[PDB]
Design brief:
The structure is a homodimer. Chain A is an all-alpha fold and 546 residues long. Among the domains of chain A are: 174 residues, no CATH class; 182 residues. Helices cover 78% and strands 0% of the residues of chain A. In chain A, helix 8 runs parallel beside helix 11, helix 13 crosses helix 14 and helix 19 packs across helix 20. Chain A starts with a helix and ends in a 7-residue tail after the last helix. The interface between A and B is medium-sized, with 18 and 19 residues. Chain A: Belongs to the SYG1 (TC 2.A.94) family.
Chain lengths: 546, 591
């Protein structure tokens, strides 16, 4: 920080007391304190520069070793070929450019340090700056290291010899099936959905207790929608520049793009549409109609768990390990991926609800149902408790535990009210009143936490972005206001949906309400992910990093 | 061979670039023709070496002079283009102080100019390297250092390698566009200086699903109002057009992968041309429309619109899409195709390129579309067999087009072979169709001379099939050549990898030529009044597939041996410089 150093030096010169007013000892003490703080700042800057230089040198050495390996592999290939040859050549040119940039950085930093150190000498009329430069700057690893230089010489030699047939002059001078499958699956899905709408209008007419079928198929519909919106989310993260691969602790290369998620969602939607069409049109009578949803879900599970290295095997093992680490939360330390997926499950509580209803329907207001409803909140609560144990800071972890226990209280009181209303007890009114108070408390708690902590909006540092924060990645300012409004609406929607789904509150219109509201909650989570990851990239709200 | 080497290298070295193979061959011949001191005097060997060196250096000086001339002319043209673009940019600025479009297009022109400048810089580098490598290999062969001295006295100081103006203009273009077109965003300007595949997949999926829907509806919904055969005769032309476009896209992909320079043969723009994805896209959209029209016609929609409108709407939309004057959907390629069709249909009065006769052959293989149009007109006229001459004329129109084109080429070149033999090959069809027509007329009416007409039809059908088959195997493809060493029955140089491809093509062509002849005989004549109708519907896609197979080897042979004596002497004009131009040199300089 050359400008900061010179400005601070000028400020110290302007604030230097005069001997004619104060004692000489006071002036000496002030100068000594100023020199001490200047040397501390110089030490901090030198340490930062040394760390950055060492990291860059290590990365350059690793890249050089990999290229020399790849150099040798291309040699053996010699012993598309030449395409790959001049690709390697482009990589070597980029590596040499990086080395030159590192040398420019080192030279500029050394020159700036030396300059600020001699101007520090002629301002205070002291020679301690030169002594500090000799003792720390001239012997610093960022300056004494000629390893970068001999790597540069080796790079020119290698480019001359094995890439240009000994010609040093150009050594100096030189130095779609996935998208198709996505479209195919999307088109088949669209036409099959139109056919499904037409068949639901005509073939079924108004007959049959089809509502159990709705309870079976809602989970699949929501999961497919979640995968599609997750693909959109990944595309947005990549386009905006949020380094989501670093946040999730994934490999820098060989990672799923948005095309992969879109094609997985399309294939799953095709299977869902075909299974619903079969259960709609009653195919050959050898196989009863109670197998097609079972077949679809069995295929989904098998596709997820299959041990053969066939379809996105790396991502399937990573997701399996993540799910196993999430569900056994207390005995595993919380990363970003763990709590991220736990929140995704918090937005997808209807799938477990329908699974439990499916089990009850196939086998045949209870306390088991409330537990199935509140499992994801329990996971998040115990994760935050484990994080507090590991960190020993009540804030924000205990506040988060309270946020995730408000849902416990609301659901428990809704279930108690339903029980006492179906039994005919006179204690229904107290349970209803407690339910309303806890419902409003939970809605306000979660909404405030989403707007203030997860998104980091409404910051006092907002210069011109009213109610936003100082730094925004996505271009339009209307996006944040739209997200705020829709989150305000959908938090209340989600609380009502949970209360209705886990409790006999609305036995007449409620079943429709849950089916309508579940995609809206998936959409709310899809909106929340954008700004949560952007806040993580900028401000590091989760504390999971250094 | 000479013709393949010409096809690969003639514009490059004969037009602008430094010859590299020529000097290498000269050195390799000199090192083999060098007299030995053990036989002749050392003075004679010295004189021979001096004479060879003088000839080589004279050739090198000529090459350097031509290189300098091209560099000066191209640099002057680039400077004028940059000045014009800067003036236009300024004028746009001042206006703004319509305009958005102006900038957008000016941006495209600036991108093209930057690409041209990059090509020119690459050119400078490639010729400088060619001079260096030739002069270095000359020294290492004759053990003389005069090559380095000559390159220092020239190549090194060669003004073509010094003009800093080429890079100065590049820097100016980079700065002005940034300061003025990307609002300073250097990364965006650089990137300026996937949806088609998605649309291809979407259309393919919709077409597939509509196809199973069509099959199921045909099996079950049936419907017995209006015999179905008129509907088949109506929709057969659209189905064949879609199939032809799909197979043509596959053909373009094969030509691209195989290295056959189909861009140069057709005389298209070396850039901004349709790939196979575009043809797949158009075919998928047209197939979706055809499937929707068939489904509407089967399912009997809202009774306000009669069911006779949907095929009419489909074909009207097809024609309007091909013809529309708005510059919206592949307007350049649509205009090129419109001009090609106009040139083909007024064939006598226009000289024959490659694209013209190629399209005329395609029309030879798609003649049942015109017959379907004729039957559609007659059914729409009369009904709200029969051996008259009009149906035969409509059948023989494409053979007439090719016959008159070959006669025009004969007048142009005054060579009886192969133009008059081609005219005979196309007149066999006239004779076969005419004699089938006479047979049908005199069979339905009932004279006893119908037997001799049947015999004449038999003999002329045999003659036509043999003629076209042998001309396919020996002339259009150029197989069964005497110069094939190991590729028995094929030709000496084969572009496509597998040898079984050629044998499969030979067998399938042998079968499908006879199938094609019998299909025309049945369609244009009441020979088979009972099972004849299904025969044409089965045989039309097979003939389109045969033409698809034919295009591969026709274009390959046109590339290697230049079978149709088409490529001329080009024209001096200017040299825009292509990436494909520099890549050949780049590949060559490494042996």
């Amino acid at each position: 920080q050359y400008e900061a150093f010179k400005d601070m030096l000028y400020s110290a010169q302007d604030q230097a007391p005069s001997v004619e007013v104060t004692d000489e000892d006071t002036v000496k003490r002030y100068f000594a304190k100023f020199e001490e703080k200047f040397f501390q700042t110089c030490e901090k800057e030198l340490a930062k520069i040394n760390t950055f230089y060492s990291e860059k040198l290590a990365e350059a050495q690793r890249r050089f070793a990999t290229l020399q390996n790849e150099l040798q592999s291309s040699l053996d290939a010699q012993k598309v070929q030449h395409r790959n040859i001049k690709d390697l050549k482009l990589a070597f040119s980029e590596f040499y450019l990086s080395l030159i940039l590192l040398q420019n950085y080192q030279n500029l930093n050394f020159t700036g340090f030396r300059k600020i150190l001699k101007k520090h000498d002629k301002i205070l009329e002291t020679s301690r700056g030169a002594d500090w430069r000799v003792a720390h700057v001239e012997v610093a690893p960022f300056y004494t290291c000629k390893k970068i230089n001999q790597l540069i010489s080796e790079t020119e030699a290698v480019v001359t010899n094995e890439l240009e047939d000994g010609d040093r002059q150009k050594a100096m001078k030189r130095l779609a099936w996935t998208t198709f499958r996505v479209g195919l699956f999307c088109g088949i899905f669209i036409v099959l959905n139109i056919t499904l709408v037409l068949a639901a209008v005509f073939k079924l007419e108004t007959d049959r207790s089809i509502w159990p079928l709705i309870r079976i198929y809602r989970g699949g519909f929501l999961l497919i929608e979640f995968l599609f919106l997750l693909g959109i989310n990944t595309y947005g993260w990549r386009q905006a520049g949020v380094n989501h691969v670093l946040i999730f602790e994934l490999n820098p290369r060989s990672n799923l793009s948005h095309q992969h998620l879109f094609e997985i969602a399309g294939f799953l939607g095709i299977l869902w549409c075909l299974s619903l069409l079969a259960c709609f049109f009653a195919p050959i009578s050898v196989i009863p109609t109670y197998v097609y949803p079972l077949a679809l879900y069995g295929f989904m599970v098998f596709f997820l768990i299959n041990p053969t290295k066939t379809f996105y095997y790396k991502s399937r093992f990573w997701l399996l390990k993540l799910l196993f680490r999430v569900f056994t939360a207390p005995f595993h330390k919380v990363g970003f991926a763990d709590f991220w997926l736990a929140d995704q499950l918090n937005s997808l509580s209807v799938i477990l609800m329908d699974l439990e209803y499916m089990i009850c329907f196939y086998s045949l207001t209870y306390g088991v149902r409330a537990i199935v409803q509140c499992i994801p909140a329990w996971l998040r609560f115990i994760q935050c408790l484990r994080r507090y144990r590991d960190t020993k800071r009540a804030f924000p972890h205990l506040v988060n535990a309270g946020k995730y226990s408000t849902t416990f209280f609301m659901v428990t009181f809704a279930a108690l009210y339903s029980t006492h209303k179906e039994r005919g007890h006179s204690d229904t009114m107290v349970f209803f009143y407690l339910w309303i108070v806890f419902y409003i408390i939970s809605s306000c708690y979660t909404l405030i936490w989403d707007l203030k902590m997860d998104w980091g909006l409404f910051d006092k540092n907002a210069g011109e972005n009213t109610f936003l924060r100082e730094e925004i990645v996505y271009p339009q300012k209307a996006y944040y206001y739209c997200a705020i409004i829709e989150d305000v609406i959908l938090r209340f929607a989600w609380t009502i949906q949970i209360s209705i789904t886990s409790t006999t509150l609305l036995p007449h219109s409620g079943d429709i309400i849950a089916t309508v509201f579940a995609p809206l909650e998936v959409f709310r989570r899809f909106v929340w992910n954008f700004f949560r990851l952007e806040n993580e990239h900028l401000n590091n709200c989760g504390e999971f990093r250094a």
